[PDB]
Design a protein around this ligand. Sequence first.
Ligand SMILES: Nc1ncnc2c1ncn2[C@@H]1O[C@H](COP(=O)(O)OP(=O)(O)O)[C@@H](O)[C@H]1O
Ligand SMILES: Nc1ncnc2c1ncn2[C@@H]1O[C@H](COP(=O)(O)OP(=O)(O)O)[C@@H](O)[C@H]1O
Ligand code: ALF
Ligand code: ALF
Ligand SMILES: [K+]
Ligand SMILES: [K+]
Ligand SMILES: [Mg+2]
Ligand SMILES: [Mg+2]
Ligand SMILES: [Zn+2]
Lengths: 300, 288
Amino acid sequence: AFKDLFKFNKGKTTFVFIGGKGGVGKTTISAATALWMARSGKKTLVISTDPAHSLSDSLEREIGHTPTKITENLYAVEIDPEVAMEEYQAKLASMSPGIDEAAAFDQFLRYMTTDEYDIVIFDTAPTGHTLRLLSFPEIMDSWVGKMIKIRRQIGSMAKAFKNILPFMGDEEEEDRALQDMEATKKQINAAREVMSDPERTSFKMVVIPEEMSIYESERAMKALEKYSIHADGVIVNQVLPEESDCEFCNARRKLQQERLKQIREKFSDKVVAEVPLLKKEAKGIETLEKIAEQLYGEPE
Amino acid sequence: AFKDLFKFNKGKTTFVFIGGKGGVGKTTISAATALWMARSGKKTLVISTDPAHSLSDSLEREIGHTPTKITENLYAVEIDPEVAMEEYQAKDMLQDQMDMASMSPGIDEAAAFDQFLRYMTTDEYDIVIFDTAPTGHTLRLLSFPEIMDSWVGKMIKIRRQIGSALQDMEATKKQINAAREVMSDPERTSFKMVVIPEEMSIYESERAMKALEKYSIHADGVIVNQVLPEESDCEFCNARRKLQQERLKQIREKFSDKVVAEVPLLKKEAKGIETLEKIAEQLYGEPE
Ligand SMILES: Nc1ncnc2c1ncn2[C@@H]1O[C@H](COP(=O)(O)OP(=O)(O)O)[C@@H](O)[C@H]1O
Ligand SMILES: Nc1ncnc2c1ncn2[C@@H]1O[C@H](COP(=O)(O)OP(=O)(O)O)[C@@H](O)[C@H]1O
Ligand code: ALF
Ligand code: ALF
Ligand SMILES: [K+]
Ligand SMILES: [K+]
Ligand SMILES: [Mg+2]
Ligand SMILES: [Mg+2]
Ligand SMILES: [Zn+2]
């Protein structure tokens, strides 16, 4: 019933963030889930916000900043902050730290605005920077709100003597600019509100059965349910299969099964599902669809 | 001879960045390396720049923002950007700005760069090892000095033009450029890349090695971690080892201008000082 953790509302894009520690399979799960959604008839966009993109390696397809068709109903984007800058200036250094998260938030605004997709899936950077991304809207909201407030105060002062001294300011134009800033703020705030709406946005946590991943994600889940991001599902990836006759495997599997117990105890309030480690690398559409089919069942 | 890739100049801090894709073992290798340097008599600081810190989990010790003793000759830091900010303001248009900036995207990389500035100055450690964030944000860190330089400059001329401490901002600008020189100086600074024998780690790290070129970062060594040992001989292991061994050949081909070393996958998780020392010893030999 992991597949039931995805809700859809006709005409309102569903958002899903796939997150977790480095190397646990975020990109693998994102690409498999997106392919599954596409086969299910959902118009799907999967977007990589990791500045070292891997979605293209994972699907084995060239993918750009603008939506790239992968297959019927599946489109993909690897965010390029240089291009994101251009699309910003045009609307109203592309290499400074923080730019990747600002450009990722811009993508969220775009698709929230158009509602062109049934579901948008974010393939996120490793934990620490994705928590920055997810807390960025509230910060952007406060900042824009403060700029507007200050700008209004300076305006009030500036025109306070128009009845005593010649005041040459253009109030019309000033009022339009304030109105434009307020509309930008309303957009930022609307997005913060969609992100913490469990009916629109969810976060699926990927872990592997190893303590360093478990502990990181346990800290992350706490930080998430602080920001009111709905984090309802945990996927345990790279689980060694029973078919392990050898002594090296047996030691590792025995330890993984104890970690699975810890996982089910630490995330006891969540739905937990497993994805087995394959005999080969998880890479390539056919392999990704088989992972999706075992996790979610056959596409509807 | 992998250990020969670490050059030391007494009185002058050696810098090492350990980088790579998520999950490949940067923290494990950083911590194993740091313990080895310390056992070897080098006064060693290992600094996590990954905003989700794992050094504490790896070394199994509580570590703070303040250098934290781990063993003789070894200290550790998990950067806390808020403490870095009050520290930085210690040396309401601004207040709200500082508190907001202290939680904003990019603050982690700025705070990491501040650590570099602090120790390149006071050569107090023989070696400082950066346990970096995964590839993509570590590139932002490594290109940050050029951006900082330009930015401070722009800020300079703009403060002047405004009239109604330019002597200080001006110093920090030279500090920044002195740091770039240290960073691109192969006698002082190196980058070790960690990869696992899987295509997604290989391609990401090949691309990253190219972006470091542009920055003149000296990358001289590749560590291939989590290599399945030969003993494993069940059907499942053999199939995986056979693939890894083809990936090792690709790694050696693609990083042919670098020295390549392997670290075996253990039968348990790599963590705790005892296990980490075994890894350093298998990788670098006994200390001195
Ligand atoms: N279930 C699996 N079985 C086998 N290999 C896997 C599995 N899931 C992920 N991988 C491999 O593990 C590595 C990390 O997966 P990746 O999706 O890149 O992770 P992240 O996006 O979290 O960095 C890749 O080499 C991928 O092929
Ligand atoms: N050689 C190894 N053998 C077994 N487990 C390992 C080995 N190297 C690392 N690990 C395990 O792999 C996972 C990731 O290692 P970690 O150092 O956190 O990576 P990164 O810093 O690149 O995120 C951890 O659970 C760690 O214990
Ligand atoms: F997943 Al990491 F450093 F913890 F890349
Ligand atoms: F290592 Al990644 F997404 F590639 F965490
Ligand atoms: K990546
Ligand atoms: K981490
Ligand atoms: Mg990924
Ligand atoms: Mg790490
Ligand atoms: Zn085996």
